[PDB]
Nucleic acid binder design. Structure first.
Ligand SMILES: [Zn+2]
Ligand SMILES: [Zn+2]
Ligand SMILES: [Zn+2]
Lengths: 59, 105, 181, 47, 608, 201, 86, 83, 57, 172
RNA sequence: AUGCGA
């Protein structure tokens, strides 16, 4: 991903970020990973799942 | 298609913050650092950097002269004919300039 | 830089307006040749009706607004049929309705010649099998709409070539010295 | 008199709005005449 | 061009404007100080015109990007001019503004309130409010400073009303208002303005008698003596050559003290940038250094001739070194210089050397401003008769094009062009491969570059190019069975391979014949490959549109490389759409000579 | 005037937030959700899945990856919205419109999406499970995602070696499992992000 | 032996061979694939009025465009020539 | 700049310039694996494919007619009278 | 020097030899055809300077 | 059509010095297929067919320790008609540094090649008509050249008509 | 630039 066909030309935020709670973070993790599970990005999702476990309690 | 696409069509760097396509350069990489596009005009010499009144960490990029820079990371690529680059040579010698506009600068 | 805006006005690529219509009729030269050859169109009427069949398009436009202005303008024109005593109450029909949208918005010169043809040929309309000056007039209006200059035409350049190219074949100064002067 | 018009332009700090077809060619831009008189977009399904 | 590499940062306009020495120093990749060009009799001199920081050279990586001559875009250096040079291009300007000032007060010799009136008019013409610009003259009422300042108040109030209204009315915008007529009224105004500025033959703000200013023509200004009546009149109100430096400090002070008017004087549109109008714009305190890329030597066959810019610029470096030598006299002289009056020759070095450096900088800009056939400068490169703009911008050479003598042929269509197999094998279309064209393109690849409907090259979606020019039937056969492989990298998954196929019977080509006197002389034809031809084959029906004749006429055949160019050349420029000319609407395409006599004989009632 | 340039340095180099320690017992909320607007290309082959097109093209490579612009490794995205090129809807429609470049079949569009970013800062005190122990560093892994290492020089000499041997803490027992550290630096310039930790503050 | 590379190698496939297609203007892989450079320079048109005193002239100390990727050479001291003639 | 559709005042017909550009761009997209909405019916030239799509209005494109003011009218192929 | 002048046709001297031009005096015999060869020696030129004139008188 | 080429070794100025390149070889590693064109003295065999790319001479420069060749670059083949060795004007020149090679390029009448009568009525050959397809006279002949009549009404080259009838009489 | 094909 090195050119327009892969990388965004421009990115701007429109407000100052919002500090997602642990509960909001975990709910996002489960919803995002669950929606994604349904291609090397899957492997990064596996790391996200470990993050889920780390934000779930236990490695 | 003819007078460009089939002749000197070049995707050239332009600084979205300085409106020129000739200050752009490839910044020097390192064993842990890739080549990054930097705009010379949109960067400060690391010897100054308000250092007297003042870092993010990753906005200094280095020249083949091993010179540290701050900024210059706002340049992009746009399609133009290369002779255009030829103009800054003479016109830019003439002490004039192109403010090559783009998008949201 | 000189081209046709989408509003039929000739603007330069700057935006400066040059003419409110192309030659004042919005007619393409590459169309005009028969746009005033009515009798020819008539003897080949059914073919042109097969080309320009209006029933496909009669749903996309208005066939009256321009025709109605044609009615008021026909009134002032029959009343005022001296030049400085102009139709100041009635601009030409091309001024009031986009000629590509309301069939009948046509130069008064073209309208006049067309009607004069219909009057001087009423006897061919008394020699035909199935044709009338209302359906024939409808056809000629539709041909006129279909001869209009397209939005975006490079008419500036076209003009320049139409003066240059034939000037290569070329009491007072004539020819190139006159044109250069 | 390219340089003379150049001088009068720079002294004005002029900005080219890059409408002239020649100028538009200079920057390698779709010519504004004819087929470049308009833009084309696409209707795409959102779901 | 590649359809596979879009960009979405197109330029929307181009601003013009003067550089700044601090800008140059900050962007400058290097200062070039050494008038040397090569070193070790054969090496790029450190800190000279060919320093490697200015790009790549002869295997040496660009010392600023470490990139080869095939990659480093090059970087522009700069020269620190010992003294501020006059900018030739604006030299007439700085001259005018010099003659317009007052030398005892350093103000413009026009009434301050009248000047402010001029600034008002030019401000209203940034917004193009012409009616108000003319309506401004009417505001009218020993004259008190309170009253002339009252005119300035009322006039500024008029600016506030006409602007506030016009922005309220949307009859302009923050970005100004610009049309051909506004530009015209501006140039007219600025001209009469220049006439008023020149008209004052004595000061008004200060009443002082300024000296007459004379100039050499392109390197010196002189200051004429005054009359004892005017000199003693100036005291009761209480030609010499001058250097550029003094001019700079004077025009600096005048241009700063008169910034308020000049802010609108130097812009035809609102200066949103709050840019100071500085006198250093007309002078060159420094000189840039072009990219090495554009300074490459003239090698003709084997012999490589030095770049003419390098020559003139080296002349700048030598002359500058001489000025460094006079500065050697100042550091040298130093010790008071009481009566060592000989400095009269070193004074010849400063005056002569200094006018010399200016003359040489001018010469580097414009050959016709220096003092047989002196290498042309950038002005000559850009114009001279037609110029760089005309010879390499308004028209260029183009790739995918051919030229050959045209030969008639009645058996082809009137919309086709017979392409000789010499051209049929060397003109390609970059065909993206699909599910519907896989068979045809696999076959074309199988044929290879040296046969009919084949393809010379394959461009991967990864960006790589694969030439088939020299691949064996085995290797091309193998690649034909690999043309449809799947994606490999998420960076490239959206693309499909490309095949550079030979031109074939489904391609349209844009034929052009010499004096394009009119658009009808350059039409799109459907390509028809003719075997055993060597010349571009053409139907007679076109010869009255090209004004062509087989006596020996040559035609350019252009092969467009893009589906937009195909669709336009098949739909707009195509020959059939060119059956009538716009000049008259007379048909330009019909049978000719022999076909006419055949029609006369065949169509006789006597022919059965 | 000489203060425009210092306003340019401070106003250009301003920092948005200082993620604090959650409850002052957790970790700094360096994880934040920020809605952004990106401008991405759309190929024609995704012309029938435009939200999925934009996803597979630009957003999928962004997860588990550092963004200089956001200042961190994208933790995830929320609420993608393609900005319609043409006014009037009921903030919604069965088809959108998008600009095609004036040269090629590729599309370009505005996009609005919420990003979940891990935005760590220097000084945050964090705990990690010891990855490695070499005589110049201790490797740890934050949340099982971010690699962190504290080099010997940044570790207090009061720490104790036990022979890649086994470091023993300043208290007099060897370290094990999780370690609490302050963030000195985060090294992202390379193929993988590295978090610079300290044991001396 | 000597090595290959004193200019370019195909970083794609590990094939260190190079082709010249003078008709293409292309430097390409002798065995494998792709474009080794799109850029191609110096084969001027019909416009060399020769005002250029072109004082430069090659002398083998500024190298050469290397237009031969074919190489072997050796380390040199600097113009054998005198040692050759000796 | 958006001239409302209810207010569109321009030519119901596609200019030859419009037809040309639409056919070029749409052909190019189909040639880049845009989903074909019509029977390929054997064809191999993407341009004639785009012509088939134009004849059926399957083209999913809209014309942005510019006015020198900057106002524009967004027109579908499926409405602008093809010929 | 005379090979010089004969190889370029730029005859230059401090008198200008009373000639309106300083080039074009010499031509390559161009033996591509016997007709061409004999024709050079029967060619007579009004001189380049009149080639520069705009009129045709 | 004959093209003459000068292969010069005037590589080094200074009016002589070193001069070291000699037509021939040294490393043997050269492609022995070069013998297919150049004699073991480095010059092509007079008479040799050459096609684009073939070496026109071979020599050796001690500076490069390599056997180099000057290639012929054209779109069409020729034949080497004569190769002339130039030692002339030289004082010593023992190295044989100047060689002149003359190429013979045959030019067959071809579609597009120009032809003209003595009447300034010039025309390109549009095609090489098969003899069977030519028109044949009752004398049993088919013409050499066919010129379109439609040319005469504008040009009024009636002298060419007279030359036709005079050449016909004069042959009979 | 000089001569020349178109
Ligand atoms: Zn910049
Ligand atoms: Zn560099
Ligand atoms: Zn004064």
């Amino acid at each position: 991903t090195a050119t327009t066909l892969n990388t965004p030309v421009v990115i701007h935020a429109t407000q100052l970020p919002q500090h997602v709670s642990t509960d909001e973070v975990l709910q996002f993790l489960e919803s995002f990973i669950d929606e994604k599970e349904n291609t090397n990005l899957s492997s990064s999702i596996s790391q996200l799942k470990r993050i889920q476990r780390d934000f779930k309690g236990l490695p | 298609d003819r007078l460009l696409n089939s002749s000197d069509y070049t995707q050239a760097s332009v600084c979205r913050e300085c409106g020129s396509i000739l200050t752009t350069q490839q910044s020097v990489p390192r064993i842990g650092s890739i080549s990054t596009v930097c705009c010379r005009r949109c960067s400060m010499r690391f010897e100054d950097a308000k250092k007297l009144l003042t870092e993010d960490g990753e906005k200094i990029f280095i020249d083949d002269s091993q010179i540290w820079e701050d900024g210059q990371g706002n340049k992009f690529v746009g399609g133009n004919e290369t002779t255009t680059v030829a103009i800054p040579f003479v016109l830019k010698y003439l002490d004039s300039e192109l403010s090559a506009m783009g998008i949201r600068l | 830089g000189v081209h046709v805006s989408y509003d039929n006005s000739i603007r330069d690529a700057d935006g400066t307006l040059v003419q409110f219509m192309y030659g004042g009729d919005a007619i393409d030269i590459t169309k005009e040749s028969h746009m005033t050859q009515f009798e020819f169109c008539l003897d080949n009427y059914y073919a042109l009706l097969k080309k320009y069949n209006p029933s496909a398009l009669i749903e996309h436009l208005d066939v009256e607004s321009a025709l109605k202005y044609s009615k008021k303008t026909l009134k002032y024109r029959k009343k005022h049929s001296p030049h400085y005593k102009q139709s100041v109450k009635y601009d030409p029909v091309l001024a009031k309705y986009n000629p590509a949208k309301y069939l009948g918005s046509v130069s008064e010169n073209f309208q006049d010649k067309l009607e004069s043809f219909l009057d001087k040929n009423s006897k061919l309309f008394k020699s035909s099998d199935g044709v009338n000056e209302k359906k024939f007039r409808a056809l000629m209006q539709l041909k006129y709409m279909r001869s209009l200059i397209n939005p975006g035409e490079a008419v500036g350049i076209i003009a320049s070539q139409s003066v240059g190219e034939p000037s290569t074949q070329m009491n007072v100064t004539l020819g190139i010295p006159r044109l250069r002067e | 008199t390219t340089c003379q018009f150049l001088t009068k332009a720079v002294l004005d700090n002029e900005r080219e709005q890059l409408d002239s077809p020649s100028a538009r060619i200079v920057v390698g831009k779709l010519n504004n005449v004819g087929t470049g008189s308009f833009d084309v977009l696409a209707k795409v399904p959102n779901a | 061009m590649d359809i596979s590499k879009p960009v979405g940062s197109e330029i929307t306009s181009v601003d013009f404007g003067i550089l700044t020495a601090k800008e140059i120093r900050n962007l400058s990749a290097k200062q070039i100080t050494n008038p040397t060009v090569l070193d070790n009799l054969g090496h790029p001199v450190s800190g000279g015109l060919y320093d490697l920081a200015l790009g790549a050279f002869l295997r040496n990586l660009c010392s600023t990007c470490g990139l080869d001559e095939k990659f480093c875009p090059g970087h522009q250096g700069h020269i620190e001019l010992p003294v501020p040079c006059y900018n030739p291009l604006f030299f007439n300007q700085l001259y005018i503004y010099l003659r317009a000032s007052c030398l005892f007060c350093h103000h413009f010799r026009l009434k301050s309130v009248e000047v402010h009136r001029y600034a008002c008019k030019l401000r209203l013409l940034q917004y193009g409010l012409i009616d108000e610009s003319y309506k401004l003259d009417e505001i009218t009422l020993d004259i008190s400073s309170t009253l002339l300042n009252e005119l300035k108040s009322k006039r500024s109030e008029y600016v506030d009303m006409a602007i506030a209204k016009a922005l309220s009315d949307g009859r302009t915008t923050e970005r100004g208002s610009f049309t051909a007529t506004v530009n015209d009224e501006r140039k007219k105004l600025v001209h009469e303005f220049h006439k008023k500025l020149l008209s004052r033959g004595k000061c008004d703000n200060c009443g002082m008698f300024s000296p007459k200013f004379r100039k050499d023509g392109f390197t010196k200004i002189f200051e004429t003596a005054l009359n004892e009546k005017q000199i003693t009149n100036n005291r009761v109100k209480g030609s010499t050559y001058i250097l550029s430096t003094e001019v700079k400090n004077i025009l600096d002070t005048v241009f700063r003290k008169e910034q308020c008017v000049l802010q609108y004087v130097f812009h035809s549109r609102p200066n949103l940038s709050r840019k100071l109008v500085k006198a250093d714009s007309f002078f060159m305190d420094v000189l840039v250094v072009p990219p090495t890329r554009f300074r490459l030597p003239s090698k003709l066959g084997e012999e490589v001739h030095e770049n003419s810019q390098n020559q003139l610029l080296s002349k700048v470096l030598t002359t500058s070194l001489l000025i460094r030598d006079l500065n050697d006299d100042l550091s040298k002289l130093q010790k008071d210089k009481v009566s060592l009056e000989d400095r009269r020759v070193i004074f010849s070095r400063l005056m002569n050397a200094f006018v010399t450096i200016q003359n040489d900088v001018n010469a580097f800009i414009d050959s016709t401003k220096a003092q047989k056939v002196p290498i042309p400068g950038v002005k000559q490169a850009l114009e001279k008769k037609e110029g760089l703009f005309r010879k390499h911008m308004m028209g260029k050479r183009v790739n995918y094009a051919a030229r050959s003598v045209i030969s008639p042929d009645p058996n082809i269509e009137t919309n086709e062009i017979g392409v000789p197999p010499v051209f049929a094998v060397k003109l390609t279309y970059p065909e993206p491969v699909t599910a519907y064209n896989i068979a045809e393109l696999r076959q074309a690849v199988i044929n290879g570059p040296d046969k009919w409907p084949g393809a010379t090259q394959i461009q991967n979606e990864d960006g790589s190019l694969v030439s088939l020019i020299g691949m064996s039937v085995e290797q091309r056969k193998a690649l034909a069975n690999q043309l449809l492989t799947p994606s490999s990298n998420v960076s490239t998954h959206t693309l499909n391979k490309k095949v550079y196929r030979h031109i074939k019977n489904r391609d349209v080509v844009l034929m052009n014949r010499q004096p394009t006197l009119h658009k009808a002389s350059m039409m799109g034809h459907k390509v028809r490959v003719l075997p055993n031809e060597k010349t571009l084959r053409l139907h007679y029906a076109n010869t009255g549109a090209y004004n062509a004749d087989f006596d020996g006429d040559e035609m350019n055949m252009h092969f467009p490389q893009n589906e937009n160019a195909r669709a336009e050349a098949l739909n707009l420029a195509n020959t059939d759409s060119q059956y009538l000319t716009p000049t008259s609407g007379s048909p330009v395409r019909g049978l000719i000579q022999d076909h006419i006599s055949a029609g006369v004989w065949l169509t006789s009632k006597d022919s059965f | 005037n000489e203060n425009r340039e210092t306003a340019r340095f401070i106003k250009k180099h301003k920092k948005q937030v200082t993620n604090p320690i959650d409850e002052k017992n957790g970790t700094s909320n360096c994880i934040v959700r920020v809605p952004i607007a990106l401008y991405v290309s759309l190929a024609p082959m995704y012309l029938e899945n435009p939200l999925q097109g934009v996803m597979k093209q630009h957003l999928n490579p962004l997860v588990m990856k550092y963004n200089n612009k956001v200042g961190g490794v994208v933790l995830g995205y929320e609420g993608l919205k393609i900005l319609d090129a043409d006014p009037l809807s009921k903030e919604d429609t069965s088809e959108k419109l998008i600009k095609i470049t004036p040269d090629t079949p590729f599309g370009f569009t505005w996009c609005h999406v919420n990003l979940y970013v891990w935005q760590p800062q220097v000084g945050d005190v964090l705990e990690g499970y010891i990855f490695i122990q070499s005589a110049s560093h201790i490797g740890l892994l934050i949340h099982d995602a971010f690699n962190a290492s504290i080099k010997k020089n940044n570790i207090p000499v009061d720490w104790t070696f036990v022979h890649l041997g086994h470091w023993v803490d300043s208290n007099g027992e060897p370290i094990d499992g999780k370690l609490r550290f302050t963030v000195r630096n985060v090294h992202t310039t390379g193929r993988v992000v590295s978090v610079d930790g300290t044991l001396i503050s | 032996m000597s090595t290959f590379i004193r200019g370019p190698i195909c970083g794609t496939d590990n094939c260190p061979s190079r082709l010249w297609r003078i008709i293409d203007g292309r430097r390409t892989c002798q065995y494998g694939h792709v474009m080794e450079g799109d850029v191609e320079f110096n084969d001027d048109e019909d416009d060399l009025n020769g005002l250029g005193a072109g004082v430069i002239t090659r002398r083998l100390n500024l190298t050469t465009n290397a237009t031969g990727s074919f190489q072997s050479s050796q380390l040199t001291n600097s113009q054998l020539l005198q040692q050759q003639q000796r | 700049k958006a001239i409302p559709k209810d207010q569109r005042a321009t030519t119901p017909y596609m200019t030859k310039y419009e037809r040309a550009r639409i056919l070029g761009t749409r052909a190019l997209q189909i040639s880049m694996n845009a989903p074909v909405f019509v029977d390929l019916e054997g064809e191999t030239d993407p341009l004639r494919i785009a012509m088939k799509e134009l004849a059926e209005k399957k083209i999913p494109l809209v014309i942005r007619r510019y006015l020198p003011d900057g106002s524009f009218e967004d027109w579908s192929v499926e409405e602008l009278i093809v010929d | 020097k005379m090979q010089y002048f004969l190889s370029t046709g730029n005859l230059v001297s401090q008198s200008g030899l009373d000639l309106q031009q300083v080039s074009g005096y010499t031509v390559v015999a161009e033996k591509i055809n016997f007709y061409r060869f004999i024709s050079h020696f029967r060619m007579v030129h009004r001189g380049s300077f009149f080639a520069q004139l705009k009129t045709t008188t | 059509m004959y093209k003459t080429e000068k292969v010069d070794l005037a590589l080094n100025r200074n009016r002589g010095d070193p001069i070291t390149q000699h037509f021939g070889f040294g490393n043997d590693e050269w492609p022995k297929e070069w013998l297919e064109k150049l004699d073991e003295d480095g010059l092509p065999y007079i008479g040799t067919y050459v096609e684009e790319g073939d070496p026109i001479c071979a020599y050796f420069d001690d500076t490069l320790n390599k056997t180099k060749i000057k290639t012929y670059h054209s779109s069409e083949p020729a034949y080497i008609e004569e190769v002339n060795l130039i030692g002339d004007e030289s004082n010593k020149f023992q190295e044989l540094q100047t060689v002149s090679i003359k190429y013979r390029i045959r030019r067959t009448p071809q579609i597009g090649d120009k032809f003209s009568s003595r009447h300034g009525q010039k025309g390109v050959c549009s095609r090489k008509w098969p003899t069977i397809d030519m028109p044949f006279s009752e004398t049993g002949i088919q013409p050499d050249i066919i010129i379109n009549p439609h040319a005469f009404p504008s040009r009024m080259t009636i002298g060419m008509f007279v030359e036709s009838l005079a050449g016909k009489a004069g042959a009979l």
